């Protein structure tokens, strides 16, 4: 994978 910073 995801490009989202809130995923990890």
């Amino acid at each position, epitope marked *: 994978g*995801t*490009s*989202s910073p*809130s*995923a990890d």
Partner: antibody
Amino acid sequence: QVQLQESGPGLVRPSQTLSLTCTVSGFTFTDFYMNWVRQPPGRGLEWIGFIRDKAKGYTTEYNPSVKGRVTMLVDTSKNQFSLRLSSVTAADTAVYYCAREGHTAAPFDYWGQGSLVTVSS
Amino acid sequence: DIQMTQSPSSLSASVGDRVTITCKASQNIDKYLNWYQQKPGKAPKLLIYNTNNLQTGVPSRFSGSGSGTDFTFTISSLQPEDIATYYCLQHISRPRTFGQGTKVEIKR
């Protein structure tokens, strides 16, 4: 053909546990996170949480809004993710969706059809 | 939590018109703001991710801009199949939060 499909809509009794399954095909589902989002009839959207991928051991993040009532599972042998929400109330009546995290285009690049769950005795 | 406020809440426009919807975050979200389109009874669909990136296959008439706390979604020339409710979504931090949505209706 990426496919997501929540288990069928139906009733849950108040103070009992909502259970859903999100059955997937058409992609390496073990390489993408999976989110759950719900939409109370006539209202907007709410992100419930996500379950991570195989590399992360399928660890989770939940919205504090359902803090402590939700667990999200995976059964890799069945191409399935599951959602359990305990002690439901009138607030938990909604259409529940599973939505793939995605890679470049994220989050929520593919969505199931959604399943309406109604809280009622 | 970051609260997302959209405007207007609904609007009606004629086919061919330019439609601009705004989305404001209560605090900075850098560029991490996505736009989804939902039709009654159907799931939301991703149109744009991270402010201005069109998802593959989405018509070129859709676009977005902004940064920080203030964002915009634009349909250059409204088409009949574009009626829906459009939602913004911040994902710079958890919990991920949605705007309340903007219902786009057509006058004919």
